C-alpha cells in the first residue's frame, strides 16, 4: 500500500544529497501531467492521407 512512499523518500534522500552537492533548484515535488507543448510536425515523407466512411 505504502510501497511507493518509502522508496520516494529514499529518492528524496538521494535528491537532498544532490541538492547540497550542487548549485540547485531543488524540485522534489511530483507535478501532475501538464498540457502538451507546441511542436512543428513536418509532412514531407509522411503525407497527410485522407479517409472517409467510403465504406
Amino acid at each position: 500500500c505504502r510501497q511507493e512512499f518509502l522508496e520516494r523518500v529514499k529518492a528524496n534522500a538521494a535528491k537532498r544529497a544532490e541538492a547540497k552537492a550542487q548549485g540547485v533548484a531543488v524540485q522534489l515535488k511530483r507535478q501532475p501531467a501538464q498540457p502538451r507543448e507546441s511542436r512543428i510536425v513536418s509532412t514531407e515523407g509522411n503525407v497527410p492521407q485522407t479517409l472517409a466512411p467510403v465504406p
Partner: protein
Amino acid sequence: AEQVAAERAARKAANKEKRAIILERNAAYQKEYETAERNIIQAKRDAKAAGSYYVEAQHKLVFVVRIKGINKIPPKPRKVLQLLRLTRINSGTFVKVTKATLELLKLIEPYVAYGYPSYSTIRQLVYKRGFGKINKQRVPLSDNAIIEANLGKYGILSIDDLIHEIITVGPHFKQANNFLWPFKLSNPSGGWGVPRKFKHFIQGGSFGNREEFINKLVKSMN
C-alpha cells in the same frame, strides 16, 4: 507640531516611485503578450510555408461558470463544485489545467460551462468583478496598495501583475487565484442562445466545454 507636510511630501515621493515601477512592468507585460501572439501567428505561417503543420501549445487555464441550481445534484459532483468554489449559480473561477483538475471537470460537465479564456475577458473580469479575500471580507480592489499589501509576499504589486499571474499561469498562480474571491456573474445579457440550457454545447445546449465561445458567453455575463 512638525511632520504636517514633511512626511506627507516624502510619502508622495514614495507613491510616485512605486507607480513608476508599476508602469514599466505593465509596458513589459504588454510587449510580452503582443510578441507572444505574433510568435503563434508567424509559426503557423512558417509551418504552412514549410508544408508542415503547427500544433498550438495546449491551454493551461480554464474559466468555469456554474450552470445549474443547488438541488437535485448527486454528492460525487456536489463536493467538486464546493472545491472549485462554485457555491451558487453563475459563480465563476479560474482553474489551472492538469490531469488532476481535468477529471474534476469531467465529473461536473452537466452542471458547468467552461472554456479557454482570452486576455480581454480576464482583464474585464478582474477590473469589474475583482474582489479580494483579505483574511476574509470580500474587499473591492479599486487601489493597487490593497493588492500589494497581501500579495507583495509573492511579487505581485498591482492589478495587472495579478492578471499576468492568471493568464501566464505562473509560479504563484494558487495564491493569486485563491486571493480572488469567486466571481459573481449576472445572467448573460443577450441570453444563453439555446432553447434548452441542459444539453451539451456540441448538441445545442450550454453545459460542457466550449473552448473559445466562453469569451462570448462570460463577457455577456459580466
